[PDB]
């Protein structure tokens, strides 16, 4: 997040996936994850690079034409 | 002993199994004789 890459092409976000999506799969597990905690902070930030790879093949298509 | 059929359906693949009615063009309409012809699903994928 956010919609900040509406103006930034330079492969920095290239490893942005390595951020929270690295051990939130280690919170996506069964038990000791979040039942009464803040359960929602999983696939509520898993569209973290999804629906954001749009205008990424319809904007980032900027190669040379 | 031998029944009247028994398993193993090779002659219901590349002959009479889903995509095997092109080898026999006038079988395509036969394949299409219960899909694009009348109601009902089909009979090769239940």
């Amino acid at each position: 997040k956010p919609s900040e890459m509406r103006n930034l092409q330079a492969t920095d976000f290239a490893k942005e996936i390595d951020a929270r999506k690295k051990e939130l799969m280690e919170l996506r597990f069964q038990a000791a994850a979040g039942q009464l905690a803040q359960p929602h902070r999983v696939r509520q930030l898993r569209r973290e690079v999804a629906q954001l790879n749009t205008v990424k093949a319809e904007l980032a298509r900027k190669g040379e034409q | 002993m031998k029944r009247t059929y028994q398993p193993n359906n090779r002659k219901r693949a590349k002959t009479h199994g889903f995509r095997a009615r092109m080898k026999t063009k006038s079988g395509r309409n036969i394949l299409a004789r219960r899909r694009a012809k009348g109601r009902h699903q089909l009979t090769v994928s239940d």
């Binding site: 996936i17 690295k22 799969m25 280690e26 597990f29 000791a32 | -």
Partner: protein, 93 residues
């Protein structure tokens, strides 16, 4: 990438009962082989993996009285791990 295969544990009782020396069991993707599932679990977390396994295990969900209800297939990847990476505490017992 370097991480986009790695995905979840396996949690068993005869895991760290039978899975203590170092071996785990993973939870990969339908994509078998092995030329991805490894370097995924190789980064800033100080843990290294090699000797991967990969198996199978289906699903089976015959629930309603009739028969309407079923499968999920899914897999897993056991691995091995020799002397070199013990624990130093993390998230598993």
């Amino acid at each position: 990438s370097h991480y986009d295969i790695l995905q979840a544990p396996v949690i068993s009782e005869k895991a760290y009962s039978a899975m203590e020396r170092g071996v785990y069991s993973f939870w990969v993707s339908p994509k078998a082989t092995k030329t991805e599932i490894k370097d995924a679990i190789q980064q800033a977390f100080g843990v290294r993996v090699i000797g991967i396994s990969t198996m199978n295990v289906p699903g089976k969900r015959k629930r309603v009285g009739r028969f309407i209800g079923q499968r999920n297939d899914r897999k897993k990847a056991i691995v091995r791990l020799a002397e070199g990476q013990s624990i130093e505490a993390l998230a598993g017992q």
